[PDB]
Write a protein that holds these residues in place. Structure first.
Motif, PDB file in Angstrom:
ATOM      1  N   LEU A 101      -0.462  10.498  -4.228  1.00 15.95           N
ATOM      2  CA  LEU A 101       0.095  11.796  -3.813  1.00 15.95           C
ATOM      3  C   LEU A 101       0.864  12.466  -4.930  1.00 15.95           C
ATOM      4  O   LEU A 101       0.869  13.710  -5.048  1.00 15.95           O
ATOM      5  CB  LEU A 101       0.981  11.608  -2.587  1.00 15.95           C
ATOM      6  N   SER A 102       1.493  11.684  -5.802  1.00 15.60           N
ATOM      7  CA  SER A 102       2.268  12.244  -6.919  1.00 15.60           C
ATOM      8  C   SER A 102       1.420  13.024  -7.914  1.00 15.60           C
ATOM      9  O   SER A 102       1.918  13.885  -8.632  1.00 15.60           O
ATOM     10  CB  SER A 102       3.010  11.133  -7.671  1.00 15.60           C
ATOM     11  N   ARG A 103       0.126  12.746  -7.928  1.00 16.36           N
ATOM     12  CA  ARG A 103      -0.881  13.446  -8.758  1.00 16.36           C
ATOM     13  C   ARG A 103      -1.612  14.510  -8.000  1.00 16.36           C
ATOM     14  O   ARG A 103      -2.506  15.157  -8.597  1.00 16.36           O
ATOM     15  CB  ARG A 103      -1.975  12.283  -9.039  1.00 16.36           C
ATOM     16  N   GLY A 104      -1.348  14.707  -6.724  1.00 15.86           N
ATOM     17  CA  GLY A 104      -2.130  15.639  -5.949  1.00 15.86           C
ATOM     18  C   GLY A 104      -3.556  15.148  -5.656  1.00 15.86           C
ATOM     19  O   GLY A 104      -4.434  15.965  -5.380  1.00 15.86           O
ATOM     20  N   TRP A 105      -3.745  13.801  -5.694  1.00 21.13           N
ATOM     21  CA  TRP A 105      -4.958  13.179  -5.241  1.00 21.13           C
ATOM     22  C   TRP A 105      -4.753  12.675  -3.800  1.00 21.13           C
ATOM     23  O   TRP A 105      -3.630  12.471  -3.337  1.00 21.13           O
ATOM     24  CB  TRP A 105      -5.355  12.001  -6.136  1.00 21.13           C
ATOM     25  N   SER A 106      -5.871  12.537  -3.072  1.00 19.91           N
ATOM     26  CA  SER A 106      -5.838  11.938  -1.750  1.00 19.91           C
ATOM     27  C   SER A 106      -6.016  10.420  -1.841  1.00 19.91           C
ATOM     28  O   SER A 106      -6.470   9.913  -2.883  1.00 19.91           O
ATOM     29  CB  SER A 106      -6.938  12.503  -0.917  1.00 19.91           C
ATOM     30  N   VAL A 107      -5.722   9.718  -0.751  1.00 20.53           N
ATOM     31  CA  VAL A 107      -6.060   8.311  -0.610  1.00 20.53           C
ATOM     32  C   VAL A 107      -7.181   8.175   0.413  1.00 20.53           C
ATOM     33  O   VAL A 107      -7.214   8.897   1.426  1.00 20.53           O
ATOM     34  CB  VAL A 107      -4.912   7.327  -0.233  1.00 20.53           C
ATOM     35  N   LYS A 108      -8.096   7.237   0.166  1.00 22.02           N
ATOM     36  CA  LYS A 108      -9.153   6.917   1.122  1.00 22.02           C
ATOM     37  C   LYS A 108      -9.118   5.410   1.389  1.00 22.02           C
ATOM     38  O   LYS A 108      -8.647   4.616   0.561  1.00 22.02           O
ATOM     39  CB  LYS A 108     -10.526   7.354   0.609  1.00 22.02           C
ATOM     40  N   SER A 109      -9.647   5.015   2.539  1.00 19.61           N
ATOM     41  CA  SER A 109      -9.653   3.584   2.883  1.00 19.61           C
ATOM     42  C   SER A 109     -10.591   2.796   1.995  1.00 19.61           C
ATOM     43  O   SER A 109     -11.564   3.317   1.422  1.00 19.61           O
ATOM     44  CB  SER A 109     -10.030   3.377   4.315  1.00 19.61           C
ATOM     45  N   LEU A 123       0.810  -1.214   0.000  1.00 16.72           N
ATOM     46  CA  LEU A 123       0.000   0.000   0.000  1.00 16.72           C
ATOM     47  C   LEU A 123       0.842   1.262   0.000  1.00 16.72           C
ATOM     48  O   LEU A 123       0.352   2.341  -0.363  1.00 16.72           O
ATOM     49  CB  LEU A 123      -0.950   0.009   1.217  1.00 16.72           C
ATOM     50  N   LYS A 124       2.128   1.171   0.388  1.00  9.83           N
ATOM     51  CA  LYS A 124       2.988   2.341   0.281  1.00  9.83           C
ATOM     52  C   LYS A 124       3.050   2.866  -1.156  1.00  9.83           C
ATOM     53  O   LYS A 124       3.060   4.074  -1.406  1.00  9.83           O
ATOM     54  CB  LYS A 124       4.409   2.025   0.754  1.00  9.83           C
ATOM     55  N   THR A 125       3.110   1.940  -2.110  1.00 12.92           N
ATOM     56  CA  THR A 125       3.171   2.314  -3.527  1.00 12.92           C
ATOM     57  C   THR A 125       1.901   3.031  -3.948  1.00 12.92           C
ATOM     58  O   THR A 125       1.936   4.053  -4.638  1.00 12.92           O
ATOM     59  CB  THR A 125       3.374   1.042  -4.401  1.00 12.92           C
ATOM     60  N   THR A 126       0.759   2.488  -3.535  1.00 11.51           N
ATOM     61  CA  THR A 126      -0.567   3.038  -3.820  1.00 11.51           C
ATOM     62  C   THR A 126      -0.640   4.470  -3.275  1.00 11.51           C
ATOM     63  O   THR A 126      -1.125   5.415  -3.974  1.00 11.51           O
ATOM     64  CB  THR A 126      -1.653   2.163  -3.198  1.00 11.51           C
ATOM     65  N   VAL A 127      -0.196   4.672  -2.047  1.00 15.28           N
ATOM     66  CA  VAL A 127      -0.186   6.003  -1.453  1.00 15.28           C
ATOM     67  C   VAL A 127       0.707   6.965  -2.267  1.00 15.28           C
ATOM     68  O   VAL A 127       0.267   8.067  -2.617  1.00 15.28           O
ATOM     69  CB  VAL A 127       0.274   5.928   0.023  1.00 15.28           C
ATOM     70  N   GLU A 128       1.947   6.556  -2.557  1.00 20.03           N
ATOM     71  CA  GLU A 128       2.846   7.469  -3.272  1.00 20.03           C
ATOM     72  C   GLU A 128       2.297   7.844  -4.633  1.00 20.03           C
ATOM     73  O   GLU A 128       2.437   8.997  -5.083  1.00 20.03           O
ATOM     74  CB  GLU A 128       4.239   6.885  -3.426  1.00 20.03           C
ATOM     75  N   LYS A 188     -11.303  13.841  -5.981  1.00 25.56           N
ATOM     76  CA  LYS A 188      -9.927  13.432  -6.273  1.00 25.56           C
ATOM     77  C   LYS A 188      -9.359  12.563  -5.129  1.00 25.56           C
ATOM     78  O   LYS A 188      -8.334  12.870  -4.501  1.00 25.56           O
ATOM     79  CB  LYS A 188      -9.031  14.597  -6.657  1.00 25.56           C
ATOM     80  N   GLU A 189     -10.058  11.440  -4.900  1.00 25.48           N
ATOM     81  CA  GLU A 189      -9.700  10.455  -3.904  1.00 25.48           C
ATOM     82  C   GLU A 189      -9.541   9.077  -4.545  1.00 25.48           C
ATOM     83  O   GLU A 189     -10.456   8.600  -5.245  1.00 25.48           O
ATOM     84  CB  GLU A 189     -10.730  10.369  -2.772  1.00 25.48           C
ATOM     85  N   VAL A 190      -8.402   8.428  -4.275  1.00 27.83           N
ATOM     86  CA  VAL A 190      -8.097   7.084  -4.756  1.00 27.83           C
ATOM     87  C   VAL A 190      -8.294   6.098  -3.626  1.00 27.83           C
ATOM     88  O   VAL A 190      -7.670   6.261  -2.559  1.00 27.83           O
ATOM     89  CB  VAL A 190      -6.619   6.982  -5.219  1.00 27.83           C
ATOM     90  N   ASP A 209      -8.068   9.581   7.204  1.00 25.28           N
ATOM     91  CA  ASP A 209      -8.876   8.955   6.141  1.00 25.28           C
ATOM     92  C   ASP A 209      -9.970   9.934   5.728  1.00 25.28           C
ATOM     93  O   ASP A 209     -10.978  10.065   6.458  1.00 25.28           O
ATOM     94  CB  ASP A 209      -9.478   7.641   6.648  1.00 25.28           C
ATOM     95  N   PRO A 210      -9.855  10.653   4.615  1.00 22.94           N
ATOM     96  CA  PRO A 210      -8.797  10.531   3.599  1.00 22.94           C
ATOM     97  C   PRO A 210      -7.519  11.257   4.009  1.00 22.94           C
ATOM     98  O   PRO A 210      -7.502  12.098   4.912  1.00 22.94           O
ATOM     99  CB  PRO A 210      -9.421  11.221   2.375  1.00 22.94           C
ATOM    100  N   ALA A 211      -6.446  10.973   3.255  1.00 20.64           N
ATOM    101  CA  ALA A 211      -5.112  11.538   3.482  1.00 20.64           C
ATOM    102  C   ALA A 211      -4.628  12.242   2.224  1.00 20.64           C
ATOM    103  O   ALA A 211      -4.609  11.639   1.156  1.00 20.64           O
ATOM    104  CB  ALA A 211      -4.120  10.461   3.897  1.00 20.64           C
ATOM    105  N   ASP A 212      -4.175  13.504   2.366  1.00 18.65           N
ATOM    106  CA  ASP A 212      -3.759  14.333   1.213  1.00 18.65           C
ATOM    107  C   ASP A 212      -2.246  14.523   1.130  1.00 18.65           C
ATOM    108  O   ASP A 212      -1.796  15.228   0.197  1.00 18.65           O
ATOM    109  CB  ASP A 212      -4.510  15.667   1.162  1.00 18.65           C
TER     110      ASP A 212
END
Length: 119
Positions: free
Chosen positions: A26-34, A18-23, A44-46, A65-68
């Motif tokens: 973030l590289s696109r300026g999108w957030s991650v959500k659970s 999941l570290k890869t998924t997070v990076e 703009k949540e992945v 959650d979410p994390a930007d």
């Protein structure tokens, strides 16, 4: 006869990818959500893309959650499904927002902490 060593390896293996998924988000300026789902182009949540209960040794959680990317992020594996040595123990992957770096810490008995993780 519990499988305490392989339990820790399996738990870490459920959060390490999941570290890869997070990076990537973030590289696109999108957030991650659970959880699972589709990319939300309105907010703009992945999604992380993994169910919280994917590994029956325990549960996966994201904070915040979410994390930007503008605050520290944790990915935890909480070993509620494990045998007696590891039940109630937690492996934490922390991404410090100031430097973008990851560390792994665990509150397991030190005998069973996986490679690359510290107390």
């Amino acid at each position: 006869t519990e499988f305490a060593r392989s339990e820790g390896a399996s738990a870490l293996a459920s959060v390490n990818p999941l570290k890869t998924t997070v990076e990537e988000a973030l590289s696109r300026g999108w957030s991650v959500k659970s959880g699972t789902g589709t990319e939300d182009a309105t907010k703009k949540e992945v999604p992380l893309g993994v169910a919280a209960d994917a590994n029956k040794l325990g549960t996966i959680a994201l904070k915040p959650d979410p994390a930007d990317g503008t605050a520290d992020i944790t990915l935890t594996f909480t070993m509620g499904g494990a045998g007696p040595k590891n039940k109630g123990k937690i492996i934490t992957l922390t991404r410090t927002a100031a430097d973008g770096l990851w560390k792994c810490t665990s509150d397991q008995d030190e005998q069973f902490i996986p490679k690359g993780c510290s107390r």
